[PDB]
Amino acid sequence: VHQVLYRALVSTKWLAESVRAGKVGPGLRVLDASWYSPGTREARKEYLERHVPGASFFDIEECRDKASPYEVMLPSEAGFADYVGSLGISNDTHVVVYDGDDLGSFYAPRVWWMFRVFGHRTVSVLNGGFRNWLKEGHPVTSEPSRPEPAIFKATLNRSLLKTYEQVLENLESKRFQLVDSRAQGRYLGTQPEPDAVGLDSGHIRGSVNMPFMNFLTEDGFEKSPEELRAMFEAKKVDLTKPLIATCRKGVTACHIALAAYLCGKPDVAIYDGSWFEWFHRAPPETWVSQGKG
């Protein structure tokens, strides 16, 4: 976020050179933000086995409001600050974040947005993810990264965040386009919502659906700005108008913010409670499912 936008995307080549130049340290910290559904892949063990040299593991399980009923909700400012500071990240650190998802990117945009919603703009996503780091035979190690702790000051940037009450008001004001990044079946209500008890699928009334995976090429790279721009247009999403991205739990919604950011729109707000909180708090009349409800 800013007028001149920071490079939201860093290439593997760039990161490889910076690592051989011995640049990771207080000025450049790398984070593996991988998280996968319980029982599929083991994000921390994978990290411990192979990570880019000097990278730390960003634990989204830790860095969240553990007291919330809802899923992966932001920590407080102090919480974020202490966590990120123990990872050796200061306000001066360029933070590069990747994950090891097979699609090339899944949680890394969420952590990109987390740094940005806590006021830190020098954060980038590794374009192609650890998948392409690996595919290109770049250096990996199991060596422990033990950064010196740093002090980090986190300041919540409220316009990059939307709450329940704000999305509810928007049902009436319609001043924000609400774009849902979940896969089409979950949006339409034909596919069930995974990993929850008694959670129906469907979508908030008035949402447009832009499945996050459509922003990535088959190789795991971000599509070019041109292709992105065309996708928003084909979906009637106007990038000059307010946009709130939502999804299941505030995570893939960040892909809509990253893609919009690469198209010159820095201010997509994330409905962090997303469908998981919406279903649980909203009147049934505010959403629709093609399998009715």
Ligand SMILES: O=C(O)CCCC[C@H]1CCSS1
């Ligand atoms: O996305 C699907 O349809 C399958 C379930 C995968 C779970 C994660 C993806 C988006 S919410 S958690």
